[PDB]
Structures are given as structure tokens and as C-alpha cells.
A paper describes a structure:
Segment S encodes the [name] (CP) that assembles into virus particles, which encapsidate individually single DNA segments. The distinct genome segments are encapsidated individually in icosahedral particles that measure ≈18 nm in diameter.
Image processing of the best resolved 3D classes enabled us to compute a 3D map of the [name] electron scattering density—with imposed icosahedral symmetry—(Electron Microscopy Data Bank entry EMD-10097) from 5,156 non-binned (1.21 Å/pixel) selected particles at an average resolution of 3.2 Å. The highly positively-charged N-terminal stretch (residues 1 to 26) of the CP, which is predicted to be dynamically flexible and likely buried within the genetic material at the interior of the viral particles, is not visible in the reconstructed density and thus not included in the deposited atomic model. The CP fold is a typical wedge-shaped jelly-roll domain—the most prevalent fold among viral CPs —composed by two packed, four-stranded, anti-parallel β-sheets (named BIDG and CHEF according to classic labelling of jelly-roll β-strands using letters B through I). Each jelly-roll subunit is oriented so that the lateral sides of two β-strands (F and G) face the capsid interior and the closest fivefold axis, while the two strands (B and C) on the opposite side of the jelly-roll contribute to the outer surface of the capsid. These involve loops at the base of the wedge, including the two serines (residues 87 and 88) at the beginning of the EF connection. Though less resolved (>4.5 Å) than the density of the surrounding protein layer, the residual genome density is comparably strong in the neighbourhoods of the CP-CP fivefold interfaces, where a putative aromatic base—sandwiched between the BIDG and CHEF sheets of neighbouring CP subunits—protrudes towards the main-chain atoms of residues 102 to 104 of the EF connection.
Numbering used by the authors:
A (entry chain A), B (entry chain A), C (entry chain A), D (entry chain A), E (entry chain A), F (entry chain A), ...: 27 to 172
């Protein structure tokens, strides 16, 4: 009975080799006071044809500026300093099984069902460690309550 | 007890690189007044060996002319302008893990079970975002009630 | 328990003889992300004293630009092209039983109870076919959930 | 579960003073093999401002050519020759309470719910006795099963 | 299981200003020995545009010749001399809200359901007091058991 | 509740002595997408007054061109090559007990009740082996669901 | 308790680019009067390293000579002419994700459990559309009742 | 109710071709007296694009120095000398389906749920047999009770 709206926000990010990098998935700012219930994210990263992109999808309050200081580099393990600060709700890994120099274009889709919502003060993040310079076009349809 | 007929319509489409492009799946026009209950679509796209084809299968009334204005480009997210206009019932993604310059020929099959039918005034669409020029030969066996 | 607000929007329209003409009833734009639950519309059309105003109140997604291409002229029948596109929830007819040249001022009121709401992506319309140039002052108190 | 379609057919008829005149309400001929379940007819007759239009809505097989030989003139009574031939399912009367010489434009609407359908071999008729030359624009949305 | 027949008898009567005037509704005489169960009468009186026609529908044995001596003039009250002689089963009133000198044509319809029949020895009457010279075309479909 | 239609198709066939000959019973082609539920066939063969006409009524998919290669000559036995291809649902035999040279005119009627319908892709056949040149006028009222 | 025998029949077929081609899976002919209950087929097609082999496994009576006239080319959709003639019981698709010019050797295995058997008059087919010249070595262990 | 802590320890190991090599997964030594309940390990081995890494995850007391003397070389089978000494709780295999000389970077993730804990005297090991020189960056989030 709550008035739901499924808004779509995209986020383009060209990121370097070992950069653990996170993007907040949230409505476009013109909707404040929301409450994210479901997220359908589909990030289609163009990447080098031998490497991998290990992604995590984490609910946390207190928005994280530095990413390497909260997630470990070669695969996204939540460090114990931000252990209970950061709650993992999504995982995954996109490996490029392609050719020598023809860069692949692989996508991960994930339909996260957030239990008891994520408000505008909390932050739903998608963080990723790649192994080459990738060209993520990460967009997401959030299912907010406003 | 309703008189069912499983008709087969094919649709060839050579489409360019970032073209979000949709085809209506429907009987051949000689059958008006139908009611699509099940669709078995099998699109065998010949495509470049590094790219992907992200497809959506959407039930909507009010036939969509412009596709980029209703679905986002790099993966098919239903924009909030056409949010409740367009109902997603099928998803998927076909990635080309092949060679440098030998173009692959990959197919997606999908047996959509449409709840409470899709009449001739509604429109069942299959829309797809590719990442290179693909040669889709999308055909489909619909299971109409006439 | 949902925070309700009853906002009032007016819409003045002087429309010609056989013009099937529709106005969207919606909040004033400063409230996006609403959900219309009840509408009390009261349109007081000043009209010529021999004619009639046949009105329909229709819930539809996909906002209709051309009105004659979706509703028939002499009384508002939903054409079969937009058959399941357009859902009728209100009807009525205001006839002018007056004098030779003294133009009457007659009003229709309608308290539509919209089942399961009408969001900001759907469009609640009031469409009307008149038979002379009328001077509708159609205002409406919507009962949105924001 | 039967595939329903709501088609709209209009019928313009300018008819003279005491002409008992009937129009078959049926789909447009391009749909044969139908089965009419519901009819929403709305006839907006422009008429002289002192007279009346007494209409009947009758289900009958065996399509009636001569109308005065089956219905009585000053109000539509089914004559005993066609007594069980013709089944009344709708009645009504539109009186013009207007001015001396300013012709009114009055409409009757009727949502007939036909029990157990009306097939294409039966004929649903709307017959009317007027008392002046009227300009009926009788249209109707039938709810056929094909 | 009784053999029913719905016969139609019309009765034209041009009657003067304050004439309380009654017509027997009955089959055409070629059917004796009937038993009237239902009557659908529809009298379309053309009348002067300021006056009224107050009608009563009365079951009585002993056919009434003089009408003013059994019903009062300005509205049809059954006088106490013929109090239990005359049983009222239908009432009504047709008022002419029209113009100065353009005579209206207004009709009353009444579907009387006679309890336990009216035989050919009883008399079902429709009596009316007008207030100007009217041009009643009173016809009726009776539902006799023969 | 399915819209039924009882259409009548006739088929004239003058066939020779030992010709096992079959006619498809089906609607006239203007109705595609049907579903035959009941068939009332009545074939009135004029025949020589000493011979017999042994007929079979068979439901089969895959329309049979050659008849002797599926049914045996002197009485219609379904050969084992088309054993499960052809399902017998009607039998019979019309013998001519007449005169030396006065050719009789004998008819067989059969009201086949097809279980779970026969669609337009299946074929209901009536096949017959005669013993002289007969003049069959085989007509049939099918009871299709369209 | 029925005497079962699991016989093995192989079928070598080198077939061209867009050839929809079908092989009957059946015992070797020395066993007539069988009843196929289970089939374990394993076809190891050597094929070009970019293409696909879309196969269908279909139970039908009336053995099909022409394959393109019953199945559509780019993916095996059963055409509506042979709609109820041909019953699909197995599907699948073998894609070659290999190298430029080193031809792969990929196999599909399928253990079809045929409900209520397939006799020697019916025909169990495996039909396949390839996209290059393939070298199928399709063999199958059928589980007949004789 | 036991005080849980999820600590993250990484272990980099560049290991040669047929080296069965094991790493103890354990907290960093500053936490003694722990009790490992859950382990989320994610090892992202960069490896040659034709080979495989077969890994085992084994709970054992008595820390193993020599690895080839407890696990067999070409796939990790627990030898019968250390049969009940070593308890397997995790398995898996990472194959490199890539290119000629472009080394892939593939990861295995495993969320081991250790029944009744693993204390600091026991040793949870992850052992792996590769087939080329790999560059494992094996890190792990253990879920200890201190």
C-alpha cells in the first residue's frame, strides 16, 4: 500500500587495474526521503579478456570514502575495522574467458531484495575489484517507497 | 477447452552497435483477435565474438515506437516514465566468449508462460541491447487462443 | 497509516463543438511520487442551453496525446486500438435543459474511489465530448498518499 | 478465460417523425463468429425540443426487415405475431424538455448484460420510435468473445 | 405451464381539459376467457406544455361507466361509494415541463404485476385526469393465460 | 461458454467401382482456427442396386493424400503402416437391396461426438469403399468452437 | 515384467550449413514390433568453432520426409501446418566456444523418458539445425519392450 | 551470544607447476585461543591459460609440513596414511579456458560452514595442486569466537 517507484540511475566508471572502487546505488537526488526495498542492478563492464571483476554489494550506514581501507584488495573481504559497519548482501564474480587482445563486454545482473528497506541515511554500495582497466556502465533500477 | 493454436512467426533484424531494439512477438496478422498464452522464442543471433546481447521480454499495452526513450541503453532498465507502462516477464543475457575475429552464432531460448494471456491489444515485446552489429533471426512459437 | 494529503488542482478549458477533450487530473507537479487514491472532481461547465457534455473518467498508463484517436466522437466509447490500454472507472452525462439563448451553467460531481491507487506514472484522465463550445472550470481534490 | 474483445461500432441514422426504426448492434463484419456478451450503447440523438424517443433493446434470431410489422408505433410493444420471436432485454425513453425551436441533443446510455451471449446468427437490435425527425448517432461497444 | 400469450391492444383517446377518463385494458375481444397476469402499458400522451396527467391503474369488477362518480376530479382519489369496489394497483403522474406553446409529447410506462390474475369478468382500468386536451395513444401488452 | 457455430459444408463426389475414397470434413476455409466438436454428416449416395458402400470416419493428423495406401480395399481396415496415425471413431455400411437396374438412393447419417475436439491442424476424414460407381452428395454440419 | 531390451543404433551424418536435418531413432530393423520407452541419445558432433547446433527431439506419427517444411530454419520451431502432428519432448542447443579455425568436437546427451511408449508405427525423431557443416555421429540406446 | 569476530587474513603464494601446496587459514596470530566457525575464502589465482588448479579444504589436527606425503599429486586425494588424520570439508577446481599466452586471472570463492568449530589447536588448511606456476593471492575472512 506504500507508494512505490522504480527509478533508474546509471553510473559510468572507467577504473584502473587493482582499484577496489565502490559506487553508491541510490535515487538521483531529486528524490530524498526514500526507502530502497529492491534493487535490480545490471553492470555491463567492458574489460580485458583475461581478467576478472569481483564485486560485492554491501549495505552500510556511514558512507565510505576510502575503499581500500574497508575492503581488501585481491578479493573483497570486509576488513575487521569495518566488520560490523558493513553488511554484505550480494556477492559475485565476472571472469573474462576470451581472446588475446579483443576486450570482452561482460555483464553481471543482480536482483537484491533488501530486508526491511534501505533508507536515504543508509547507503547501499556496489564495490568491485578488477584486475585491469575496466569500463563499467553500472546502472540500477531501485524500488523505493517514495 | 479453448481452441489453441501454436503459430510460428520469425523476425530477422540486423541491428547496429548500441541500438536498444525491440520486436513485437505476435501472430502473423492473418489471425486477429488472439490471446497469447505461452511463447517459445528462440533467437539465434550471429554476433561479434567479444560482445553481449542483453535482452528483456516485456508485456505492455500502448505499443512503443521509440525504444531508447523507454529502456536505458547499456542494460535494459525500464525508465520511470514508462515504469508501470511496461511489465518485465523475461530477462537474460547472451555473452560471446569466442575468438578475435571469428563471429559467433549464439542463441537464447525462452519459454514465457504469460499469466492470464496477452491479447491483440496488448503487445508482448522482446527488446535487446547489443554491443556490436548483430544478425538476429528471432523466431517464436506463440500459443494463442484462436 | 500512510501520510495522506488532499490537494486541489483546477483546470480551465474552453473547448469547441465536437471536441473530445481530456484533462489529466493529477497534483500540481510540486508533488511528484504520489499515489492517487480518491478523486473528488466537480466540473462546472457553462454551456449552450440545448446541448450535452458526455464525460468519461479513465485510468490509463501511457499518457494519451490524441484524444479522438482513442475515444469515439459522439459518445465516449473506448476504441479497440486502445481497448485494454484505457480502463473506464467513471461515466456520466450533463444535459442542458434550458432556454433558447440563455447559456446554462451545469456541474457534474464525481467521487471516484480508485482501487489500489493511481501512481504518478499512471494517468487518471477525465475526457469529455461536448456538443457546443463549453467553458469547463474542472477542478478536483485528489487524495494522494504523499 | 475466453478471449474477449471490446469493439466499437457507430451507426448514424437521421429518421423521420413516426418511424419505428431499428439498428442491429453487431461487430463491424470483419469479425464473424463472435458472441456478444455485454453491450455498452450510448446513442446521442439530436431531436426537436418537445418530442420523445422511446427505445427498446431486443434480442431476436431471424433478422427483422420490416419494423412496424413487429413493433407497434406510438410505443414499442412487441406484437403477438412476433411475440416469442423477439425478447426484450432493454427499455427506455428520452424526452426533450427544452425550448420552442432550439433542438436539444439528448443521449441514452445502456449497459446491457446479455445472459448466455448473443452469437452472430442471433441479432441484438435497438429499435426506437421517435416523434420528430431525429439525428441519432448510435454507437456501441460490444464485448464479444472473439 | 399455463399457455401464456402477450397480446397488444392500443387505444387512442383525445380527451378534454378536466375529463377524468378511463380506458379498459383488455385483449381485443377475439380472445375471451383470458386471465391477465402482467400488463406492460406505455401511454404516450401529447399534451400542452404546462399541465399534468395524473393516472391511476385500478383493478375492479363491475365495469364503471361514469368516471367522475367514482374518481375525484383534480387527482384520482377513489370515492368512498366505490371504495372497496375499486382496487388501486398503479399510480403515477406525468408533468409537462416545456415551453409556452410548443406542446410536449410525454409518455408513462408501467409494468403492472397483477397478483392472482385478472379474469375477463374483472376489468383492469387505466384512468387519468388531465389538465388540458391531451392526445393519449395508450397501448398495452397484456400477458394473458389464453 | 465457448462461442459455438454449426456450419454446413457439402462435398459432391462421383467415384468409381473399387475406389477407396476419402473426403475431409471441415469448415469452408473462411473459418480457420476452428475446433470441431460434433459432426452431423449425412451422405446420400445414389448407387447401383446390388452393391454396398462401406464407410469409415477417422480422426488423423497429417492429411492423407493416397487412400489405398492407408486403408485396405474391400473393407476399410487401417493398415499397420498408418496404424496409430489414423484413429477410427465412426463405422458403417450401406447396402443396396433393390432391383436389377433401378439405381437406389440410400443415405447414411452419423452424429460423431469428437472427444476433446478436432482442431484445424488435425483432419477428420470420411473414407468409403464402394462396389460400383456411386454419386455421393456427402454434406455435414460441424459444430466448431469458432 | 515386460521383456525389455536396450539396443544401440548409431547414425553418422555429415550435414551442411543451414540444413535442418532429422534422423529417426529406432531399433535396427531386425526388431520390428517394438515399443520405445526410454532413449539415451548421445550425439558427438564435430563442428566449426563458432557455430551452434540447435536440436529438437520430437515424437510424431506419419514419418516426415521434408524437414524444412515442418520445422523452421534458424531454430527448430514446429510450424503450424504440422503443429499437432509433431510433439516436442526434448530440446537443446550446443554452442561452439572455441578458436578461429580449430574445429571443436562437442556432444549433447539426452535421456528422454517417453510417456506411454513409442511404438514402431510412431517415429521418434531427433532433428537439428546447424550453422556450419557438422559431422554428427548420433548414436542412441533405446529401451524397447521387445 | 558468543563474541564473534570476522577477521581477514591474506596469503600470497607464487607456486610452481606440480606443487601440491597448502596454506593454513587462521587468524593473524595476535588472536590466539580462537574457534573458527565460518570461513569465507576467496583465492584469485593468476594462472596460465590452459591449466587447472584443483583445491581441497581440509580440517585436520597435527599441522602438516610435507604436503605431497599426505595428498596425491594430480588431484588431491587424501592418502591412506593420513586417512582419518585429514577431514575433507571443501572441494573444487578452477580451470583456465583462455588463450595461448595471455594468462588468466580466475578466482574461487568458498563459504565453509565448519561444524562444531575449529580451534587454534586444529588447523584448517586449503591445499591446491596446480598445473603451472600460479600466483595465488588467497585471502579469507574467518568468523572466530574470540
Amino acid at each position: 500500500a506504500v507508494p512505490t517507484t522504480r527509478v533508474v540511475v546509471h553510473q559510468s566508471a572507467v577504473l584502473k587495474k587493482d582499484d577496489v572502487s565502490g559506487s553508491e546505488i541510490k535515487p538521483e537526488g531529486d528524490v530524498a526521503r526514500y526507502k530502497i526495498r529492491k534493487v535490480m542492478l545490471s553492470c555491463t563492464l567492458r574489460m580485458r579478456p583475461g581478467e576478472l571483476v569481483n564485486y560485492l554489494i554491501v549495505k552500510c550506514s556511514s558512507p565510505i570514502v576510502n575503499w581500500s581501507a574497508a575492503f581488501t584488495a585481491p578479493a573483497l573481504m570486509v576488513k575487521e575495522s569495518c566488520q560490523d559497519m558493513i553488511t554484505i548482501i550480494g556477492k559475485g564474480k565476472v571472469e573474462s574467458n576470451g581472446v588475446a587482445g579483443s576486450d570482452c563486454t561482460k555483464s553481471f545482473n543482480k536482483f537484491i531484495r533488501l530486508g526491511a528497506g534501505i533508507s536515504q541515511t543508509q547507503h547501499l554500495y556496489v564495490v568491485m575489484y578488477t584486475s585491469e582497466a575496466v569500463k563499467t556502465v553500472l546502472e540500477h533500477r531501485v524500488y523505493i517507497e517514495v
